[PDB]
Symmetry: D2
């Protein structure tokens, strides 16, 4: 059994299973609008780890949330904990990419008794917003909810065109990465494929974490952390982020590659696996 559907009280999620059942327990969390194939190159190279590569709600093959429910960062965090519950995992590790790393950091700072270590790829904290702009940000979220019903779903008469659309998407990623994502990310429609998604995933949060919030979460992490930063990712590029990371104990490894370096090619996957295999052996 390597592809399972996990039933939570409120939602059903899909996950792809890697590694030996006696392996160290890991939940692998992907980035915004991706799916579990984000780890298709990396997970097989991490021997000794039992890796549950989860599709977040509204992504890959996991269910969309019920009517009215939100896609906030801590909704994902709850879902992950309930996945751990269904597996019998009391302490487990998190391997996260981008948004998945942000969710992992929130979980580790909120529930340090549950999280054994963090392996993070080019993600750490969310975009923040301060109290002075909060009334305005809530108005924007409420107005976008009203407009949500009239929200676009693109269609692609043919496979490689959908792949190509993803190569030019949120960030730059290799054709093979896009192909790997597409195998879990496309659903058939009349007249071809669309990228399975939930329009609500484009809604702005009604309440952003303030910088102090984000800082208190990273400061609340109690387990070891290995943070891979892509040289051509804009995380490593931001100067404020370099300053923040120097104040933190997290283990940093800069590696050549883009935001999706673990997926773009076998060389990036192998480079990332080296760092994390060593991390987990300790």
């Amino acid at each position: 059994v390597e592809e399972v559907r996990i039933s939570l009280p409120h939602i059903e999620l899909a996950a792809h299973l890697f590694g030996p059942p006696d392996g160290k327990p890991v939940i692998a969390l992907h980035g915004w609008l991706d799916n579990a194939m984000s780890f298709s190159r990396l997970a097989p190279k991490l021997a000794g780890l039992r890796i549950v590569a989860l599709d977040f709600a509204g992504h890959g093959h996991s269910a969309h949330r019920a009517e009215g429910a939100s896609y906030l960062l801590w909704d994902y965090a709850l879902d992950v904990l309930m996945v751990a519950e269904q597996l019998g995992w009391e302490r487990f590790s998190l391997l996260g990419h981008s948004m998945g790393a942000i969710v992992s950091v929130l979980l580790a700072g909120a529930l340090p008794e549950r999280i054994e270590r963090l392996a993070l790829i080019d993600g750490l904290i969310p975009y923040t917003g301060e109290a002075d702009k909060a009334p305005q940000k809530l108005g924007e979220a409420l107005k976008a909810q009203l407009a949500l019903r009239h929200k676009r779903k693109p269609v692609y008469a043919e496979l490689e065109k959908a792949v190509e659309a993803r190569m030019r998407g949120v960030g730059e990623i290799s054709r093979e990465a896009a192909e790997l994502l597409a195998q879990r990310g496309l659903e058939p429609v009349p007249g071809g494929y669309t990228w399975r998604t939930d329009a609500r995933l484009t809604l702005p949060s009604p309440l952003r974490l303030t910088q102090a919030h984000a800082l208190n979460f990273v400061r609340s992490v109690e387990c070891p952390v290995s943070l891979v930063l892509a040289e051509q990712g804009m995380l490593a590029v931001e100067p404020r982020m370099r300053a923040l990371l120097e104040t933190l104990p997290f283990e940093r490894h800069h590696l050549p590659g883009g935001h999706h370096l673990h997926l773009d090619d076998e060389a990036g996957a192998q480079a990332v696996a080296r760092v994390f295999a060593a991390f987990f052996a300790r």
Copy 2:
């Protein structure tokens, strides 16, 4: 000859119940009630306010409104979105808010977020929510996540006598008159095997995953651009809180203090009339 007084309002994600008061051509007002109450909170006040077309709305998970779908939250800004979608479904572009306790807090959030939509605020014994600072936010998220994991299917209290259901509501919150409790019970009880239960959603007991900071709350109140009339109960808590008074002296809101408890507009005809005098004059101009 007969007029429509009780309706379902269909929103895209949920169906809510509402009682309609006043002339179809009256000034448009949505009335929002307190936590674990329902639209009967306005059963004495709304009839006393002539010239107003008042939609007294049951919040999700209260009164006769639907419970939210599985996995959905009961955060303050979820109610705020529901209220705005009600105004859309009614075809209302600009409207006023009449709010009691939690309903007042929701009204402030809406007015501060969307000043172009809210004409005025009439607030009863409520203004800003309890707040939480960033240094405690990790601990509060963990408590919120733990409570979610622990939430269970349990038989809420059952009362074989209606009298006893009413009495259980008097023991609750602060002080509330027997008449107020009975009015709330008419819309707040559901039949179950062997009696009545106070209809509720278990998720309403869960703590927020992320509270507003004191600075968030201040920014929302300082962002309200429309006229505001705030009534404080003399035997409630807000009228005695000195931090509350210091805040109000920095704000342009009209303030009135009236005798009675936290439900003064519901306890008796006199308090209902006392609040109506303040709101009728405010809405008249």
Copy 3:
């Protein structure tokens, strides 16, 4: 001291609305209304039946009851299950049914299927549904499947004026009085941008995928074990289908022929009283 008259009844799969009539300790009766009507169908009749505890239920997708979840059907046995679950949720082991039109049909199905639970049947101008034999069944299923594919494209009329919503109900279906249409409108209208719509589920227009055959219907009628009182409107069912008269002659139901239309119990006080006299004597035995 105030009594509870309007409630939500929570079933495992749906939440229904009901109006409560009579003393809490009266004989238990669930009152079931006609297709596209609501509990106000019993607004004149139920108050006249002293000593009966009547739960006037809104069927799913009608009045103020919730619409069924996505993909669920509105077949006659679906309503029967709901009614059985309503009795469970009220704690009622044995109970009687008071049914009008479609609601009478559902009552007969329930009485025939679970005779152990049903003490008495009071039926107003309804008995069996329209039937279909096996030779048209593949055709009818194809037509039901096609209607399901085409259902996305359904919309409900909007009435800017309340009077216009009422008059739309007098023309629609059979002939009912202006007062009847007003009474049903009090519980059947919801507000929408620029006016009112008769609250309804578009699935209610779908044709059944499998109609009961004539033998099914007659077996259900024959399977009723309890005393039955049937009211026959002079201008209702029998005027529409005089073939029924010979069936009725082979059944042990008590029959009362009364003037008026299909909604004789709601059209006016004269019909309400006459039906009430018949049912009040029936329920006393």
Copy 4:
């Protein structure tokens, strides 16, 4: 490029899972499995049907497809509507059906109801459902309603060991190869606290409220207009029964008895090859 093998198919009311086999330009076929099985039922068979574009569908409630919403039924004609909607979502107007057991019964209902849509039926060890006559229908509805009430108290079994769940598949109704059980278990088992559980919806155990009569079932089989290839197991009840043998000689369906059990296309590679041969020819004509 890599190819898309596993997909979700979004219908208006439910989201299903499917595995895609074969050349994207091949003959359009939807493959339908048996009660409590899943798309792995076609794991051996579909790879051997070259030239065919086979959508191996998980029925609602089975495998990796969503469960139906609260209150929705799992009746034969609900599956049939889902299959039609899958075809629409795929942009298929005319298509073939490959069905095992329950899936074959669904396919016959579809062909009989919409002959203009179904190119060919390839049926494995199924044809019509168990029927029931009108004189038993009140009692059968009663049993279905009672089962709906009792379903509350059920909890699904939990196997601490993978294997006890697999070999739990072999026990009960049906004889089936261990390879068959493990193949089905790959898509039909889910991890839970305590071990694994079979993913199928507990409501799948509910008896139908209304069976087709013999006449209905005959009218459907006799309404099928397209070519039909039916494979019967010699080790199955369908082939041996005389009333069934008599019916088949009256029907213009290509018929082949093959050695093997009810799941002969899945028990072993030899059985799969055998069925492949018959169907591969049938689809070439």
